[PDB]
Design a protein around this ligand. Structure first.
Ligand SMILES: CN[C@@H]1C[C@H]2O[C@@](C)([C@@H]1OC)n1c3ccccc3c3c4c(c5c6c(n2c5c31)CCCC6)C(=O)NC4
Length: 290
């Protein structure tokens, strides 16, 4: 079904919380019988004729998206006596990539990481064809369908590109540390398919570091910009980036992987590679690891 009756959505537990709004695990159980399917339901804690307009669009977007590497949309639920709208998506028990990479830091080898990279690239190439920008690409936003299959989640920050432009100016930031975004995003609030690419490079980094805290983007960068005094991090970060400073090669990270990484971090958005050009490059490296 596409429209879920509010009263048949049995709350199970909390899946996650955001700066605003949240996602919880429920089970659609009209009988109470417990044979209803479990789903992932996001809802806003701040309903007003403004952020709802954003949520409305978010729902339409995910609904229009048809990719194996993008969290699947199930329906909506015009909630409890309304303006209490709720987004219903599939539920992926294995959780998000972030924790997965930590729980399985062992079993996971380069080819597998490349596989996830490849699949993420794919779901990203597709989004681009839909004139859409994710804005918040990160390992914490990637979910696991199965051992060899991941998907992109959280489209709460996504933006549809106006027909006449290849970029969007959004004052609202993403939810990850400033070290995940493109310079133009940080200095001029400009996001685009090319900015998604940059953040994709950070994801790559996260994968090959297995989302370790010691060598995470923040950790490496903070211990790299430690300088000036009392200078906002944002300002000192941009400065580092302008000087050619980029994240290092994660320990035991194949050389080639780090080179693609650096490519994604081209100061100029037009110098970064496209997802369609990245995909086959990764597929090579994957088939190169056997
Ligand atoms: C660390 N990141 C959060 C982990 C957790 O809650 C979040 C907030 C975030 O995951 C994208 N989350 C969403 C946010 C916006 C739209 C959809 C989701 C979402 C979704 C799921 C999900 C899960 C968890 N989180 C999930 C989700 C962790 C435990 C495994 C399942 C899910 O299974 N499908 C949609």
């Amino acid at each position: 079904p596409t429209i879920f009756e509010e009263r048949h959505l049995k709350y199970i537990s909390q899946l996650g919380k955001g700066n605003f709004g949240s996602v919880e695990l429920c089970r659609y159980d009209p009988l109470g019988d417990n044979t209803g399917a479990l789903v992932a339901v996001k809802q806003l804690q701040h309903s007003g004729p403004d952020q709802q307009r954003d949520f409305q669009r978010e729902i339409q977007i995910l609904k229009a998206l048809h990719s194996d590497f993008i969290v699947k949309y199930r329906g909506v639920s015009y909630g409890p006596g309304r303006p209490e709208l709720r987004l219903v998506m599939e539920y992926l028990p294995s959780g998000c990539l972030r924790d997965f990479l930590q729980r399985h830091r062992a079993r996971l080898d380069a080819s597998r990481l490349l596989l996830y990279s490849s699949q993420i690239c794919k779901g990203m190439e597709y989004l681009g064809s839909r004139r859409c920008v994710h804005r918040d690409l990160a390992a914490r936003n990637i979910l696991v369908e199965s051992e060899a299959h991941v998907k992109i989640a959280d489209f709460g920050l996504a933006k549809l590109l106006p027909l006449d432009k290849d970029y969007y100016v959004v004052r609202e930031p993403g939810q990850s540390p400033i070290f995940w975004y493109a310079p133009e995003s940080l200095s001029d609030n400009i996001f685009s398919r090319q900015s998604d690419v940059w953040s994709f490079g950070v994801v790559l980094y996260e994968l090959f570091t297995y989302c370790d805290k010691s060598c995470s983007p923040s950790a490496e960068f903070l211990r790299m910009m430690g300088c000036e005094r009392d200078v906002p991090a944002l300002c000192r970060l941009l400065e580092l980036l302008e000087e050619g400073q980029r994240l290092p090669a994660p320990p035991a990270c194949p050389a080639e992987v780090h080179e693609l990484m650096k490519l994604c971090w081209a100061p100029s958005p037009q110098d970064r590679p496209s997802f369609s050009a990245l995909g086959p490059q990764l597929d090579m490296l994957w088939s190169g690891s056997r």
